[PDB]
Ligand code: CHL
Ligand code: CHL
Ligand code: CLA
Ligand SMILES: CC1=C[C@H](O)CC(C)(C)[C@H]1/C=C/C(C)=C/C=C/C(C)=C/C=C/C=C(C)/C=C/C=C(C)/C=C/C1=C(C)C[C@H](O)CC1(C)C
Ligand SMILES: CC1=C[C@H](O)CC(C)(C)[C@H]1/C=C/C(C)=C/C=C/C(C)=C/C=C/C=C(C)/C=C/C=C(C)/C=C/C1=C(C)C[C@H](O)CC1(C)C
Ligand SMILES: CC1=C[C@H](O)CC(C)(C)[C@H]1/C=C/C(C)=C/C=C/C(C)=C/C=C/C=C(C)/C=C/C=C(C)/C=C/C1=C(C)C[C@H](O)CC1(C)C
């Protein structure tokens with residue numbers, strides 16, 4: 045079985061049953077069965093949210109270059125005021141999140157449509173609703189379960205890159221790649237920061253500290269700026 | 274049996290003559306633990322091969338460019354074109370990434386011998402790795418292992434140990450004199466009694482710090498000498 | 501056999517290497533009586549865990565002060581928070597004794613009567629307050645990720661790291677007080693001064709630690 049460190053022995057709890065199992069659990073966070081059952085769903089949810097966000101941020105930059113994703117919340121203007129938009133989001137997510145959660149707490153107890161009795165998801169697994177949520181499957185499901193986790197772990201690490209790049213460069217994903225491609229030797233973080241016993245040098249936060257939005261002033265801090273290289 | 278580091282000394286029981294360059298020399302008994310001896314032998318191989326490349330670099334560079342001082346070649350302003358004043362940070366980026374791969378590969382071979390003896394990409398490409406620290410194959414492109422490997426391992430460790438002492442001579446001579454290893458010899462031969470450690474020692478000719486592209490790197494000599 | 505604090509000296513009898521961080525150190529035999537030893541075990545863990553949070557709090561806020569982020573020095577934070585935020589000191593202190601009082605008294609009676617806080621008396625919660633071991637109250641509230649209920653060997657190793665890191669933090673907090681008292685500056689200001697001049701800027705030249713110096 046391919047492993048994260050060739051030649052290494054995987055944790056005893058990491059046999060190889062779960063998709064994406066490359067024997068990586070150095071801290072032993074998944075040695076408890078009931079804990080592993082939660083973290084597995086959490087990894088899937090994080091993966092799918094990140095994959096859509098990384099796709100959306102890149103597309104938004106191409107279709108709407110003038111708008112920096114980090115500044116979108118304040119810039120995007122709609123007739124449905126911030127509160128009206130949030131109310132709708134809150135109720136819709138409360139329902140879907142509770143429905144998905146109850147599946148994890150009692151599998152098979154939330155596969156039935158609550159308005160139409162004729163529609164019920166077939167018996168399935170937590171994290172893999174299927175049924176109406178899976179109209180087409182282009183290939184072996186097991187193989188795609190590996191593709192989903194691998195493309196998700198990469199996206200989750202990309203978003204974090206988009207965030208730190210935004211705070212260190214003030215630019216969207218593409219605008220950074222171009223800066224780096226213009227001068228790779230002088231655009232890497234090593235060429236932007238340096239700590240030695242004598243002194244410490246860190247790139248400045250390029251994100252305004254506060255934003256003014258509909259007369260509120262929203263706090264907008266950089267992430268662990270004090271611990272920045 | 275074999276020759277030892279001194280006349281009358283009894284070799285440690287753990288040093289029986291298996292490893293090349295075994296003069297039964299372990300005054301501080303650091304090889305008594307088998308696990309430690311294995312790691313220390315790898316460490317000794319690493320320090321030997323790196324030091325032999327270092328002695329050869331300082332000497333070759335000194336002959337080709339006698340105007341460039343080895344102790345201060347790392348300064349980017351002294352980098353050869355087109356690398357002069359190149360972003361040192363960007364340069365360290367390449368070294369960290371490349372070295373980290375090769376060093377973790379070699380490391381995993383220590384943790385599990387013969388566990389990383391295959392190309393992780395182009396499967397089928399494999400190094401023989403007869404002994405730990407001796408990969409061979411692509412690493413031995415001329416086939417010199419297919420002979421008296423043990424006698425060649427002796428020449429390697431012996432030349433390496435001598436090069437490790439020499440390199441530290443170059444460093445200390447550079448710190449006390451301010452010149453490279455062939456320039457120091459010339460100064461000695463120029464006036465052996467006039468120029469020697471008796472007078473050279475007592476002075477650190479190295480600044481306290483240098484500004485590299487905006488960063489102050491603190492510098493120290495190996496002894497409290499006038500700095 | 502087990503490494504001891506003073507190599508060559510036999511470990512005390514009341515110390516059999518069973519407890520985490522057992523290096524046979526009890527020169528004044530203060531833990532000779534067992535029940536007393538159990539109490540001191542929870543005491544060292546509670547002192548140590550607070551010191552670890554303390555040390556990590558001072559180090560981060562000290563870094564933020566070293567850089568230009570406007571974080572007050574640890575010895576000045578108490579006044580800054582109350583002043584800038586117009587917080588009433590008496591209210592905050594009494595609220596703390598209310599919350600800590602509840603948590604401490606429940607931990608106290610668990611020590612006096614192990615498992616006695618899992619009867620459901622507290623909002624019907626039972627298993628989250630039973631306690632795994634003295635000074636180790638696992639469950640789903642205090643050990644939310646199950647590290648104690650998965651891989652017994654990993655649990656033992658984690659206990660060793662916790663006690664050693666807690667004893668280091670307890671030593672570090674005594675250092676933060678002694679250094680402030682002797683120098684009047686912050687901890688990362690002291691580290692910068694030493695790093696700048698390690699042979700001329702240390703305790704021997706502070707004019708306080710060695711009076712005859
Ligand atoms: C009759 C006297 C009586 C006395 C003196 C005590 C004393 C105590 N009880 Mg006890 N109880 C008493 C009766 C009863 N208890 C309980 C049930 C419990 C339980 C289940 C527990 C205790 C616990 C405790 C201890 C809590 C320790 C602490 O610091 O708390 C102070 C902590 C506080 C949080 C203070 C409470 C709030 C404060 C008075 C201010 C309130 C502010 C609010 C904002 C109010 C706002 C209201 C508005 C918004 C509507 C304590 C020594 C606890 C303990 O340690 O057990 C080992 C515990 O777990 N008691 C019942 C019902 C069975 C009782 C009577 O019927
Ligand atoms: C591999 C061996 C190697 C050796 C023996 C030397 C030796 C030398 N370099 Mg050199 N270098 C070496 C590699 C490299 N150098 C440079 C870049 C430079 C520059 C730019 C300069 C030197 C300088 C010097 C000289 C003075 C340095 C001194 O006194 O140290 C001072 C040493 C220290 C303060 C501490 C360094 C050791 C540290 C323990 C190393 C390990 C730390 C880790 C990398 C990570 C630490 C972070 C952790 C906590 C996460 C000296 C002759 C200086 C010079 O020429 O002065 C005239 C100088 O300015 N070197 C690069 C980057 C391409 C190297 C890459 O491998
Ligand atoms: C978590 C995913 C996510 C989030 C939070 C956002 C958020 C945002 N996007 Mg965006 N986007 C995404 C994914 C996402 N996008 C993806 C995957 C794509 C590629 C198709 C795009 C392509 C895109 C473009 C081209 C643009 C935005 C724009 C915007 C901003 C304002 C436009 C808007 O939302 O008005 C309201 C949005 C709607 C009315 C559409 C309703 C939602 C559809 C119709 C239903 C789909 C539901 C779906 C099945 C649920 C699963 C998704 C999953 C993430 C949970 C806003 C901050 C605009 C912008 O940048 O403004 C400056 C803009 O130009 N996005
Ligand atoms: C055996 C034992 C045991 C018993 O028990 C006892 C006792 C005695 C303790 C012991 C002993 C020990 C010893 C002797 C050791 C030695 C060491 C050394 C000297 C090393 C070096 C080592 C050395 C080394 C590595 C070296 C390295 C080097 C290099 C890389 C190079 C570099 C460079 C060059 C090219 C040039 C330029 O311009 C600069 C630079 C960049 C700088
Ligand atoms: C064992 C033994 C045995 C034998 O028999 C005898 C003898 C020897 C006697 C013994 C003992 C010894 C010792 C050494 C002890 C020690 C102790 C300590 C040091 C503690 C600390 C301890 C310490 C600790 C807790 C700490 C804590 C801390 C905290 C909470 C916090 C703080 C802070 C912060 C964050 C920040 C802001 O600013 C505020 C404050 C508030 C300021
Ligand atoms: C229980 C639980 C359960 C679930 O399941 C999972 C989880 C969540 C994971 C868990 C949790 C955990 C935690 C919370 C941890 C924390 C820790 C810490 C804070 C530590 C510190 C720790 C800390 C420490 C050691 C400290 C250290 C310190 C030191 C040495 C110091 C040093 C120094 C001094 C003195 C002075 C100067 O001037 C400066 C310096 C140089 C700075």
Ligand SMILES: CCCCCCCCCCCCO[C@@H]1O[C@H](CO)[C@@H](O[C@H]2O[C@H](CO)[C@@H](O)[C@H](O)[C@H]2O)[C@H](O)[C@H]1O
Pocket residue numbers: 578579582583586587588589590
């Ligand atoms: C048990 C665990 C904790 C043990 C250690 C606790 C140490 C507490 C140290 C407090 C030292 C300062 O003591 C406290 O200082 C603040 C400083 O504003 C005072 O605070 C006073 O003014 C401020 C406004 O400026 C307001 O909170 C209020 O008007 C009043 O309380 C308190 O009246 C005083 O009691």
Ligand SMILES: CCCCCCCCCCCCCCCC(=O)O
Pocket residue numbers: 593594595597598601602605608
């Ligand atoms: C600043 C102080 C405000 C008052 C805070 C009081 C909080 C209640 C503390 C009561 C603890 C009683 C514990 C029971 C006695 C015992 O365990 O032996």
